[PDB]
Amino acid sequence: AEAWYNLGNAYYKQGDYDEAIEYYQKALELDPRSAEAWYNLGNAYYKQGDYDEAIEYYQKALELDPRSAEAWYNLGNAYYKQGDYDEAIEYYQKALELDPRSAEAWYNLGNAYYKQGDYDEAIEYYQKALELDPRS
Ligand SMILES: [Gd]
Ligand SMILES: [Gd]
Ligand SMILES: [Gd]
Secondary structure: OHHHHHHHHHHHHOOOHHHHHHHHHHHHHHOOOOHHHHHHHHHHHHHHOOHHHHHHHHHHHHHHOOOOHHHHHHHHHHHHHOOOHHHHHHHHHHHHHHOOOOHHHHHHHHHHHHHHOOHHHHHHHHHHHHHHOOOO
């Protein structure tokens, strides 16, 4: 499994997402235990724009390891990209409960409320983002 996985990683690193998907899937057929491997498969589908696949593989990563702030955040991003703002808010909130440090993540939670037309919360979360990073 480990060898196929590293081949997928090398393809991913040069931007070849369809090859990374082929080799990650071969790795996961031989050993499905690693949360991080499912997460990297989700990321490959996300980069290709196949967001429903990204969601399925992020959810599989989180089933195996629910303490990944990064996995919740990327799950939120995949829902955001489908126009599923209610789900994006839920998963962004779960990510920020595990790790409140990223200005960028608060900002995106603000963006999801803005897209729902809930401007109060958009302002609450934009203000949290700008306290952490006023540069944009
Ligand atoms: Gd390719
Ligand atoms: Gd596609
Ligand atoms: Gd799909």
